[PDB]
Every structure is written in C-alpha cells, then in structure tokens.
Design a protein around this ligand. Sequence first.
Ligand SMILES: CC(=O)N[C@H]1[C@H]([C@H](O)[C@H](O)CO)O[C@@](OC[C@H]2O[C@@H](O[C@H]3[C@H](O)[C@@H](O)CO[C@@H]3CO)[C@H](O)[C@@H](O)[C@H]2O)(C(=O)O)C[C@@H]1O
Ligand SMILES: [K+]
Lengths: 755, 337, 887
Amino acid sequence: QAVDETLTPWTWNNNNFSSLKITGENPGSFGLVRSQNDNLNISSVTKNSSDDNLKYLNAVEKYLDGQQNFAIRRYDNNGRALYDINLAKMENPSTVQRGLNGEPIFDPFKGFGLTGNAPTDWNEIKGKVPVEVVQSPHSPNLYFVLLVPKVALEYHNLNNQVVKESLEVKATQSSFNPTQRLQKDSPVKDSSKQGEKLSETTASSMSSGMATSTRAKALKVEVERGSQSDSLLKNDFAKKPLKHKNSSGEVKLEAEKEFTEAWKPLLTTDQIAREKGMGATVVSFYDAPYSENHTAFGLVDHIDPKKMVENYPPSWKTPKWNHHGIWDYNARNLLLQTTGFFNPRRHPEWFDEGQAKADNTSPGFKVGDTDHKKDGFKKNSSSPIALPFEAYFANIGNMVAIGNSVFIFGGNGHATKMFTTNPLSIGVFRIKYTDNFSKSSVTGWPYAVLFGGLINPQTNGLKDLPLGTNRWFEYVPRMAVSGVKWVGNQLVLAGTLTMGDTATVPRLKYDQLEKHLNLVAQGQGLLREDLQIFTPYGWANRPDIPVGAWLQDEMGSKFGPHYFLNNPDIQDNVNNDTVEALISSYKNTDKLKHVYPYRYSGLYAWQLFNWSNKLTNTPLSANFVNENSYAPNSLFAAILNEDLLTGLSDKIFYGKENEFAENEADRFNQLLSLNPNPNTNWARYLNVVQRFTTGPNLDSSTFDQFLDFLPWIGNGKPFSNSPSSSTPLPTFSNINVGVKSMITQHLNKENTRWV
Amino acid sequence: LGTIPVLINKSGDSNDQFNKDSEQKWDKTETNEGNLPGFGEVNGLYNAALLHTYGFFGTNTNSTDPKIGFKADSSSSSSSTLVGSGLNWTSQDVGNLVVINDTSFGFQLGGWFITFTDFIRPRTGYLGITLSSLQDQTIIWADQPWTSFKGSYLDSDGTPKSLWDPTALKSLPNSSTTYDTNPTLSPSFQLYQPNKVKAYQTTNTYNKLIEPVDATSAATNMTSLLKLLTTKNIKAKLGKGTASSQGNNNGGGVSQTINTITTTGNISEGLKEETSIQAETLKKFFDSKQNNKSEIGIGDSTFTKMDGKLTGVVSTPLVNLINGQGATSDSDTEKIS
Amino acid sequence: ANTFLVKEDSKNVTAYTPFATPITDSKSDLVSLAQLDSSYQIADQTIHNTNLFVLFKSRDVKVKYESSGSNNISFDSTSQGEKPSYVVEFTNSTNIGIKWTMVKKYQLDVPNVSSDMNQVLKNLILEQPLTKYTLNSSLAKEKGKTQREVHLGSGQANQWTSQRNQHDLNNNPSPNASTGFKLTTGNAYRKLSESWPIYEPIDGTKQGKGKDSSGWSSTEENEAKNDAPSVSGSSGTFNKYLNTKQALESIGILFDDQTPRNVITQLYYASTSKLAVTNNHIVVMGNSFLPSMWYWVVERSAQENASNKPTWFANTNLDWGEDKQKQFVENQLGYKETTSTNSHNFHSKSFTQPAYLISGIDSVNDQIIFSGFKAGSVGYDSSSSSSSTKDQALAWSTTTSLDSKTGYKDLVTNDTGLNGPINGSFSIQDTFSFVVPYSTTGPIKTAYPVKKDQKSTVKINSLINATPLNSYGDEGIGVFDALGLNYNFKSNQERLPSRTDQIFVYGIVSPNELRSAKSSADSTGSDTKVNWSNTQSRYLPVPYNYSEGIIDASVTTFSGLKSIAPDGFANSIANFSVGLKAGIDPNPVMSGKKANYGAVVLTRGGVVRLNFNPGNDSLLSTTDNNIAPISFSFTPFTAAESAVDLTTFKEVTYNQESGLWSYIFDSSLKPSHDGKQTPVTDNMGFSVITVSRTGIELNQDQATTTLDVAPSALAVQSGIQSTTQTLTGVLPLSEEFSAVIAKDSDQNKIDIYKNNNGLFEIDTQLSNSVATNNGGLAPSYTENRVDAWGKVEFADNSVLQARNLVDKTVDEIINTPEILNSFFRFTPAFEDQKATLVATKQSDTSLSVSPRIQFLDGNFYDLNSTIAGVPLNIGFPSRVFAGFAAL
Ligand SMILES: CC(=O)N[C@H]1[C@H]([C@H](O)[C@H](O)CO)O[C@@](OC[C@H]2O[C@@H](O[C@H]3[C@H](O)[C@@H](O)CO[C@@H]3CO)[C@H](O)[C@@H](O)[C@H]2O)(C(=O)O)C[C@@H]1O
Ligand SMILES: [K+]
C-alpha cells in the first residue's frame, strides 16, 4: 500500500509514455516506475530445439516476476509521492461497489465502497505491466490503464537465436557476396507453345475515318463465360507463352528451398487470442488522493486480436490476389515479385507462419492449370493477413478518451522492431462503456477504411500523393504513431506513414533482369528500401500490357510496335494523319478489347502520374494501386472527427461490394464502384479525417528549395552549398545548375513568351 | 533523418581512392569529368553534390580527405553500388506528440524536434513548419541512436523539451567474435547489389541514356565497396568510428527547441512572383539568410548537462520532475491553513 | 403555429403536433375549399405571415398553339380543359384547432404572344423530356457537318488556309470542328402543337427520327410499338426503343389514353409547379423535369377575378457574371442578320436564353431566390430543296482553350468558341486534347456555320433541349464537356469551363425586378424586357466518377459512354437539380449588421450553397476576379448521398433554430414500370438528407465584413431511411430528434430517430414511449416509469420539518424556485432533458407543485399547454406539501 522508494520512473520505447497529468476536481500525476537492479540474465531461461515458443515465453514471464518489480504510483501537484500501486503485490484488491443506477458508492474522506473481491481474470492480469494511462473527459474520479506482458518491454533483451532478424547474417567462409541470395534469372518464350499469342485484327471498323498505313494492326483480347461448369469459352488475359528459366532447377518464389530456418512470430494471432495471459488488457479504475479507500478497480477488457483481424476487409483473406488479377499476377511472378498487395515475402510481420509462406502459390484463386479457359475462378485461401505478436504490440499504445469511450492508436513499433523487420500501427482499437458504466465492449479497425475519404482539398501541402483507394481496400496505410491529443477544441493525430510503393510503378522488359539487379532485389524483399531509383533504359512501354502481347518482336528488328524499351526520343508520332492506323478505329465491346501497335514512352513522373494510387477531388476514385511500402516514407498529421469516432458502431460490416470478381467474365466487365448493401455499414467509417498535413505549405520546385535550405545533422551544412571559380553545386534544386536557356524551341514552340 | 544513400565506384582503400581535386569538374557538367552517374541514382536529387555535403571526399567532415566517391571513365567497363550516409536513424524513430497552445503542436523525430505551428489556422507567406536539430556528435554517430532518447514533454515556462543520455547506448547483437563480418545486420544496412556499366563518351556524354551490362559476376571487382556496405566501416574511414570522435565522455541532460515569435516562419518576400520562377526568388531570399536560419523557424536545439543517469520524467501542470526529483516547498502557499 | 402541415395526398393537408399526432378535425381538402373541381391537385404550398399559400394545377388542362391570328397560346374551351392553375391564400379562422377558410384566389393565365415572338414560336421545336430511364446513348445524336464542309464544301482542307479569310475564319485551326448534330435521327423534337412519343431510342445515333415528325408516324412509330409494346396484363424485346410511358406520367406528362397531350400543354402544366410569397408578390415557376419558358409575378393586390400574366424568360435578361458569358449563350441561340428573310429564331429577333430547368424558388425578407440549369437552346436549319446543314442543329463546344491565362475571370471571358466552332481533336507533338491549344498572322476568328452564299436564302429556326447540353454531337469533346474532364497542362491544372453546356444559373430578385417582369407580361403590342442584375451563371458538369472506362493516356463518345450512375438516372451526362430552399442563419452577426441568409439546392453528385450579403440583398462578391464568384460553392456527395434517388425528392424544410435543411425522398414517387415495362419493386421507403453550412460566414467580427472564400454547405445522409415503410411525414423536432410517421401495413406508426454524433438511429424505447399516447395528442405520463416525460419522484412531506422549511411561509417558498427544485428528483429520458416545478398556493399553510418538462422538441409542457389552442391534457401530477407557517 504505502510508498516504496526502490522503484524509479522510466519511459517505454513504443509509446514514450511515463506519466499522466490528472485534471479537474483533484490534480496531480500518475507515472510508471520499475526496480533499479542490474545483471538481468534472461539467457539463463534455456530454450530446447524440440518445443514451441509458448512455454518459453511463460517461463520468461515467471522469471521476470522474480527478477524485477513494476508499479504506477500517484504524485501530488508538486511531485510528492502518495501511494505505491505495485499491481503484482498490492493488498486486498477489489472492484468498486455500485448503486442500482450503476453509479459507484463514494464519500471523499471514506473513499469508494469495495465489494471485497477482485475483478474477472485476476489470476492472469497480476503478471502484466501497465504501459499507458488516461482519464475520463465527462466522469469524475474515473481513469483507464493499458497493460501488456513484460516481454513487450524486454523483447530486445531476450536471447538472439529465438528473437532473430528476418534475414540471416551467414558465416561468410567463401568471402561475402550480396548476389548469392537473389533469385535473378529472366523468363523466356516456351519452346513448345509459341502459337497461343494474341491474334492480329484481320479487319478494323471504319468509324467514319479515312487514313491508312502499311504497319501491322492491333491485337485482340477476348473473355466470355460459355456454358461449361468450371471453364470460360474465352479468356485471353490468362495466356502464358512465357515460362521461367531452368538453372539447376526452375527459378521461382519457393520458400522451403531458400529459408532453411525460416523466421516466424513469437506467437500467432490465434494463440494470443486464447492464451489470455499473453494478450494486452485495458482496465477502468477509480482514484482519490486523500481518502481511506484511496484506489479500487472498475472493469477488465482484453484487447483481443480477433476483434481487429475479423474487421479486416474481405480482400485481406487473399493478400496474394488483387482486382487486376490474372495478367498482373503473371507479370509479377515472371519478374519474380510479390503477387497481390500484401504477401509475406516483403511483409512477414503480419503472417502467422512468417517467411515459411513467402511464395506466390495458391492465391485463393485457380491459376497455373493446362488451359487459359480453366484458370480464373475463386477457391479456398492458403494464407490470410493476421495480427501476430510483433505487429500486435506495434498496434498497442497511444491512448485517448472521448465521451463514454477510450482508444488505442498503436505505437511507433519500437516494442518489436528489428534491423530487417518493420512492425507498425495498422489501425485503432476502441473500448466503449454502457448501462452507466455497468458494462463494456471492445473493437478495432484498420487505417485502410478510416482514411478512405482523403481528397486533394483536405491538405495545404503538395497534391496527388500515393494515398488514394477504391471499392477494394488493397492500399494498406500503416504508421509509426507519435500520439493523439487535443489541440484546443480539435482532436489531432501525428506520426510517420506508409504511402503506396513508388519504387516499382515503372516495370521492366521481361529478359533484362541480369543487368537490373537492384531493381528486382528492391521488389524481392532482399533490399527493404522505399526510395525511387533512376532506371529508365530497361522499362517497358506501359506497366499494364498483358503477358500474351509481349512476344511480338523477340529480335527487336521492328522496335517492338506494340511493346518495346522506354526511350523518350523514339516515341511514335501521332501527328494527326497517323491516329487512324494506331488507335482511331479499334472500338471495344462487352467481350472484346485491344492492345495498340503504338510505341508509348515517358520518364518517372509520367509513370507515376498514370499508374500511382494518387489522391483526387472525390473519394474511392483510384483504380490503380501498385504495392505497399516496407517502412514509413511520409510525415503525417491530421484533424479527426471526435464526434464520428464516438458515434460509429462497434462492428464494421463489409459485403459482396468489397469482394474480388468470382470468375474472369465478371473481371472483364468489372464494376468500378457500388452503393452499400442494406445490411452493410463500411461506408460510414470513410470520413473520420477532416484535414491532413505532410510537410511545408510550398508549391512546385519551391519545395525542392526548402529541401536544399535545411542543414545535414552530420556536419551542420545546408544542401544548397552557397555559404562556401570551381565551387560545388546543390543537390535538390535546379537553380544555378548547368546554364540558363530559353524554352522557346521545346515541344509545341508556343505560349512560352507570355504564359 | 539524414539517411539518403549515395552511389559509389571508389573507397578510401589503397589504390581505390577518388579525389576532391583534379578528378571532379563542377564547371563542366557537359562531359564525363562532371561525374553524373546516369543510372542507379536516387530520384529528384544529384549524387556528387550529396557526396560533397556528406564530405565523403575533401576535408568538409573530417581533418583529412576520406577519398570515397564516384567517377565516370571513357577507357573501360565499370562497377558501382549504393552505400549508406554514415547515419543509423530511421523513420520509426518518432517520439511524443506535444501541444504548445490552442493551435501549435510538435513532436520528436530522431535528432530533430518538428512543429506544425500553422496547421489549424493557415496564412499566406508562411511555410507552416519549424525544426530544431540536436548537436551532440556522440549521439548522432551512435550505432542504435534512438535508444539514447529518454522522452519529450511540454514545460511550464512555455516550451517543449526533451531528455538524452550518451551512457544509454549498447553494442550490436554480436561483436563479430571470430570472423570478418562484412554484412553486419544493423538499422541502416541493406543488401545493395552490384550495378555494371559501359564506358562513358569522352564528349557529348549525356546525349543518350547510359547503358548497363550483365552484373551477375561483378562482385569480384568491388570487394572494398562490399566491406563499405556496413555503416561502422564508413564511420571508420570518416574518422568517427572510435574515441577520435571526442567531445563529452558522459554529458546526459536536457534539450530545448529554438525561441519563437509571430514573425517566425514569415517568408512573404520569398513567396509569390512578378519577374521570374518562384524557387529562384526563394533561393535569393535564402542566400542572404544562410547564417540566420532561426527567423525561418530552422535551427539547432539549445542543451544543458546534468549529473548522474537520466531514466525518465514525470509531469504536473506547474512543474516537471527528472528521475522523480525536483519538487519544492510551494513557498507562495505556506501561510494558508 | 406550434404545428407541422402534412400533405396526406393530392388534396388534403392535416396539421400535426410535435407528438406526431394529427390535430382533430384539422384534415382539410384544400382543393374542395378552393372551390376547384376534383381534377385539381396541390403542386406546392408555403406559409407566409401565418397564412397558407397553395399552388393547384389540373389533370384536365388542355393548351393549344395556333401559329396564325395572334392570341396564339390559349386553353381548349371545347369539352372541359379550360382549367388554368390557381394560387390560393388560406387563413386559419379558429383560435382553437384548424379551420382553413379561403382568402384570395389567383388564376395563372397563358402568356400573351407578341408578333416577334410568334414568328420564333411558329418553328420552335422541343426535345422529348429526359426521364429516369433515358441512356447516355438515348441522348447522343448523329454528328453534323464540319466547319470546312459548311463553307468550302465537298472538297479539301488543302485549301483551308487559302479560303478561311473569305468566310471570316482567319487563323481558325479547326476545319474539322463540328457545326452540330442531325435532327433526322434521335430523341423526338416537336413543335408546340405536336405530341412527344412514349418511346425513347436506345441508340439515338441510329434509332430516333429526331424532328422528322412525318417520318416517325408513317415508318418508325410501328417499329418502336412492335419492339416496345406497353404492358397489358404482352412483353417484347426492347432491342431498339425503351417505352417510358409510366416514367413520363411520373414526371407530370399528361395523356388522353396512351398518347401524351401537346408540348404547349406539358409546358404549361410543368410551368405551374413551385411557388414563393413576399409581402407584395406570388411568384410561380416550373419543375426540374421539363424546361419552362415563362414564370408568373402575381401582384397580391390583384383584383379578385383577374388573369395574372406570365413573363417570358426570352424577355428576362440575366447577368451571367460577365457580358461575354451572355454573348456565348445568345450567339449559339441562332443566326442574326438584316440580310435574311423568314429565317426567325430567339437570337435573330433579339430575345435572350428562352428556357430554364428550374431547381425551385423561395423568399427571404422580400426577396425571391431561384436557381436552375440553362436548358440548351440552339438554331437549326429547317431549309427545304442544296443546303449542306439541312435538318442539322447548329451547336459547338465553347470550352476555354489550353493557353488561357488562368484565374476565373479570364477563363469565362476567353474569346474561344464565341461566334462559332473551334473545338474537336488536336494532337500537338504527342499530347492529345479536344480543346484548342491556343486562343501568328493576327488573332483567331470564329464564325457562325452558315456559309456567306446561303446567308440570304437560309432558314435557321430555334429549338430547346430536354437537358442542360447545347451540343448532342457524338464526338469525344461532348463527353468531356458534359463530365467536366477538359483540363489545362499548366502548373495547377485548373479545369476548362464551357459557357453553353451544363450552365447553372441562380439569383436573388428584388421587388422592383418582379415589378418589371409583371410589366413585361402586361406589355401592350411589343415585347417589353426585364433586367435581373442580381444573378450569376456557373459551369456545373455531372461528376466523371458517375461513369466508367473513359479512354486517355476509338475515343469514347455519348453512344458508348458507360453509366454507373447511383442517383436513380440511367444517363450519366445530363445534370439535374431539385429543392432550392433558403434560410436565415440563427448564428448572431455583429450588431449594426443584418441577419445572414443563404440557400441550398441538390444537383447530381453534390449540394450547392448560394451566398448573399444581407446588407443590400446582393450576391456575395469579393474584390479579386481571380477567385470565382463567391456567391456559389459545390460540396460533393459521398457514396451514401450519391445512392439517394434524386427523382424521388418529395419536399425540403428549413428549421431556423437548428440552421439545418431537411430533404425528404419518398420512393412511392418511382414510376410503376421501367422502360422495358418491368414492374418497379424498390418503390417502398424513403430517405432524409440533412444540409448544414460550412466555412467562415459574413459579419462575425471586423475580419468577416470582407470575405475572399465562399461559404459552402454539406449534405449528409442522416440515418433516417427505410426500404420497408410507406412515409406519411418526417417532423424535425430538433437537431437531436426527428419523428417519422409511416404505415408498415395500413395504420400510422411513430418512430423517433435520435442524433448520435451526426448519425440518426432509431430509439425503440423512446418510440414506444412517444407512441403510447392512448388516443390523446401527447405521450402518456406514468409515475413509476422513465417515459417521454422522464421520471419525477416527489420528496416526502417530512422534508419541510427536517430542513426547517416550516419556519418559511408559502409565499417565501413559492418565490424561491431553487427551494422548490429540492421537492423532486428528476431522471431524464434523454441527456439534458429538463424539468421544473410550478407552485400554486392552496391554503395559508400549503401549496401544490406540478412538473414542467421538456419534450423532444426543446419545448416545456405542463398542465395548461396547448397546440393550436387545444389543451393537451398530458397528465402531469400535482403534489401537496403542507405544514409551512403563516407569518
Ligand atoms: C480540330 C482540327 O481540325 N485539327 C486539325 C489540326 C490543327 O490545325 C493543328 O493541330 C493545330 O496546330 O491540323 C491538322 O492538319 C494540318 C496539316 O494538314 C495536312 O493535310 C491533311 C489533313 O490534315 C487531313 O485531315 C486530310 O488529309 C490532308 C492531306 O491531303 C497538310 O498537308 C499539312 O501541311 C498541315 O497543314 C494536323 O494537326 O495535322 C489536322 C487536324 O485535324
Ligand atoms: K414519467
């Protein structure tokens, strides 16, 4: 009960909490404290080869219960300690007694009435450590605290052969070489299947056009359902005249032949939900500084992973698949990349089997059979997105309270991060109270649906950032979270955020991988880098040409009229007489589409402007999404609807409006948007953000001027280089680089003099 | 965070060196003597300028020339790789959100404190951001640097503040123990691959895109660069890797953001246009202010030392307590009972 | 009036209490009371200074147009179709209950027609009305002649540069710009004396007869009929033609059996749809469904048995924002010339924009606000004989060029397309655009596509479209014009407006302005004109995300554009607007400034805010012409508001306490049958959209006298909706609560919806509490229950002795309301519901107390409360306390 001076205050790395300021009727502080003692040899808890992690983690918690003490003492308004609150050790623990209207029975000098019995699950809460504390905005003397297993603090002090990196260091006995891990060999035309390519348009409709040319025509693509029980009648997007290399066996993503001791979670999402001692907990409690009965508990809630994972969007059951489907799946697998939008080859932190499922196989859809008409149907999934131990504690921390409810926005991830492993906050939990605080409820939702209302009007920074989405939640935003607080009247969020993947929107020609090793390694999970890299000489004409169309100039002797290398100077001129042969005739239908005999080309900005998940002026608009970031690559802060965050229902209901197409005939005429069904409610959650910000309130090259103005912390020198013949040049801005000249000779040779 | 990578052909090792002088021509960007890569470079920026700002060649960052860099040659086929900046910070190194008044708020992000002062009420001619940088070389050149940050808080004199302790750092998961650890798994390490590239044209060098070649055996020609992938080997060649860094041996204590007024971040003479392009008039407006950044809201955080360990803070609406010490008799209230 | 009026049907208005109960005997057949026959129905109604103003129109109405004589428009007296529409003023004669009695009755007569007017009307032709079931491809019309075919001819664009000076087309880079669209195929066009068909073509590019009246009825009408036969419970194939007869009846088209009545009749019947009332005037305007060509300003002073005359819109000059914007519209109305003969159109006879699709109409202070869409009007060559543009409409994109100096003023005053075609397709370098890249020997000249040779002998007559598009031509610029998809390539990408297609129009009209209009309408002999100088226009396209699969980066045109339109329309190209409503901000303004007011109106994909300056009753402007007229703001709908079927709009209320607009949609308004004659089965239920204001409003503090950012609005689908119940009425009791009255089967039921942080949800316990009235006007009181009146427990009498209040007298206690709040403990049924005790002296030694309790509407009720003067007799208790002293 009374104060013990042997426990000293500390800051947790994952949320940076250490104290709460109490406000209103009796001010003061609560703060975290721990025992001062050194020589914490956790490696003495020996791990055998013949058993799983759970009995080891329970032995580490039992060891830490002996080796350390933790508590949450109260202080007065000047910082004098009042009472100790070591939750593992305090005398006569009880819940608070209630009147028939749910109110706690109280009188300030006596304190609260105690029932004389502890809350539910007391036999497994007593081992947990408290890590964040908050106060009710509307109810007097009422507080909330968040608790975790002590391994969520000690994770980096556990022994290194179980708390591994996602990549091995190796013994380097043959000397080191970074090319030995990379799957690298490029695909080739099939020696026994050359003829299944797209057909050339034998006659093309006039459409009241007039001009003509000698060049080869556009290529037809057709899809239709037929009458057969398990096959289409046509499916030209599912053609496969390319195949992988043989180099002492076939080159492919095949985890069991690469990962000899595959990296895996400390616990799976279905373990943490059922092993009630390993899940995080929130409790309500009551406190008064000068009473006889100064402190007692309210109610206990589990921050259950299933209350987050069962609220993932329907597509997160099949993270190896996306709404473009068969052609995009094949083009990614041919380039040895991650298929879908979230697979574990890049993102193992959210999967219960970690690296052991780092493959493109069995994506929840029928693919790779002997006939293009037989591929392209929905089936059972091989691996859904989960919430395993490492991602779970990155989704814990950063609390706030609003009305009769309290929240958890997740941490920065420094609970569970490793040098090749990037767990993050992927959303928000809420805990809600009912029957005048007699009862409670718990839920959570991902940022992917909560950010769905973002549009270009909602920021004073730059426009068109890779933050857009559509009717399928295949864009997956996640954050290292700085916190949530009241800025005067406004509720505000801050941190760092994942964009969509900007490094792989431009795409390679199929054969050239052996001269582009970094650009494939950056897609392979071997290089975990999100920065954009200059590589234009090896890109194809468009990111979205289907794999059946590519093999139209294997010699390069026609400069590939339908598909060739991205050089900007040798683009086909549409002029105005040219269009009738190359586009101004090839009309599409409800079963027929075309690939044009036109040499498209352009540099990195034109690639992103066409195929990035850019923001726009209206929500759910972004039909193109590439892939999701390794790590946070944006600043982020936002203003929230605190009312709507209080008003939204506990359970999100999705429906068939968020499902991928069941077969490819529904993919050919695929609906871009739909109204919510009568039973569903997902569209209500889109609007929790009012406004957001990302950097300086500057436009165009002016922003590159700010990038040049700030000092580099390693030497105190600005990247602009101007504060001291043969002087050096700046890096970000173009001012004083090279020479001035007039743009009057460029492109159209017009408007430049005045506009 | 200071962790943009740079592209390299050449290390500080014997006969592998690249020079600040007689090997780079800033006045002649039309030819290979300007050393622009044309392949494998980070988008939007320029590599040789970034190498100069890092000081990988010349006496800019160290008491003698480290001789690390990139060169374009017309005599032979050549090899390169990306390498790190020498810094180990990362974008997950974000600390406490703190609110200063009814409209202004900020947070710690690695070696910086950042403030979003105008987000609730924007204005014309204001850039909307302020930034304060840490100075301590013992923190900035550490191997796991964010572990030295002890928390950030609002203080009752009207400023945000933070705590640091140079005694809090620890070694990597192993000390190499018995073998030459070239791939030291660490927060700025990556498995960067060889890029192999054809000879540059001696004149009219950039009239066409630069052409890469089969890199699948290229690693044998570039073993010095493969050793330079680990940040500790970059720091060693920059003279930062050991006690040659100097400064305070201990020196934990308190850090504070720069002073501010209603004029701070007003750049209205660098904003808008009437003669030229807006970045160029902002560049003119910045050039006379390179030695006076604090009125732009850009600068270094002030710092004071403390005795003993820093473990954390606890906070009240009147006072902040360090390790739980700093309380007072409340002398203005003694006579009331 | 402490009541809500509910239109139970086409004839009956019943008054409801805040307890969602009818006031007894209040239910009144306003048709019968207006001494109108059983063919009349209520179109619109409004309260002004506590009297009820009703607009009635007749299903029996028959109008005629005879091109000769000159009382050209008249009612058809023969049979029984002399059935003009009436406005009627009713007053409540009783102070207990509701006895509506008739005060003033005004007939809405047919327009006078001048000579100049009747020459345009002779050959005026009108497009068949757009419906629910009209497709992008139904609208689409066959592409007309190129500018260089019209002029030079069959022949070459190798001579385009030698020749364009000899036809006033100097420096014109657009030999292939379209001069418009063919009237031999598509949507039926018809004169005032003809009838539209019940059949709409699926591909109007192929399947219509357009203005080919004679061709329709001898060939293509039998095809349409055999392909698309009316139901008869038949069923057919609908390969070439939808059959929209029931969708037609739905939007107010009238019928002798299976044939619609003449155009002039449907014009009149639509024209008398909406009303508004000021101290001096009744104004009457048309619906959002047909174009209207006239409106009424009735002088409320008008003698008892008079014939109030409508003012033509062709005689009503608006300010479109800048003179150029007027010229754009007037240039494309038709060919003007002193040189031509019998070639008469609105432009050639010096009329202005002749027709609007009106959103609706309201009054604030003594001001009429209106808004709507410019109904497309263009010239068409009705020539007979080798006329190249024969049977062709003369229309062109007027969309601002790429090089246009940016900033609004510049954009809308750009000389691009001003006098003729300029827009088509352009492949500069390798960057496709439909819009001219620039607008050098000298400056670019545009000309009207009637070749100099035929200038004397040509016949260009006026038509009106069914929609806000001028140009139906099946080229790619038409889609981009209609969808808002033309953009510049500068360092901002500001969107390039049209000034002829998709043009929204609003204003505020002063009582002097309504006075000219009445003057135009009474004008002896010639056409008198009216200037309305408090108006603006705005390019307001339908949203591009209400379509799919548009090509960029076989260009997509109207005949191939794919609709995904969620808002109850097949088509995704023609904008629509409905339920304009004004309202006074309740939010205080700085003293010595007058109360703020706005209006809002729904359009496809968003709510529009109109903003006013109460100071001089003007549109809000700001000094800069760079920022765009600050009188208008557009806030786009989310998925939830986009999903509401806008063709089901029933009514819009504004509440001055909440400062909130309620838009009621009733799905019982859907037609019985599809265009394929399939029974329509989602005709059950209703929906409410709540509009609020957003931004910094005028005159908060010294800073907000000046504004350079337009205030806007926000439409939220509130949560009050149903796909099961039949609506009677929605009573917006308060910001926190709405009462819905509905039938599940056939009896009325009361649901209460409670606002939870911006989202309304049913409260089943409060619904049951409110609905338990036991046949009374208000919810029961039960002592032992937290009901609609909360719960009141009285102190025991023994409290007086314990607290020494026996030493206080009755008069002391009775004048000490804080003492007598200590005589009960109150449990609210909803948060912040309040209650007090009213005290009454009973003897020297004793008093009684009786609770005064707030209901859902924020109002206090007690034993003596009335609605409409009728005691509610709710049943609050009384409680004696006794033992107080006499001093
Ligand atoms: C909307 C429109 O008509 N655009 C036309 C453009 C436009 O004027 C420019 O792009 C603006 O910079 O002009 C085009 O034509 C110019 C050339 O025409 C050639 O003649 C062709 C003709 O173009 C074709 O329609 C039919 O065959 C003719 C040959 O018999 C001339 O030989 C050449 O010198 C140019 O004048 C263009 O952009 O090419 C046509 C566009 O439709
Ligand atoms: K009661």
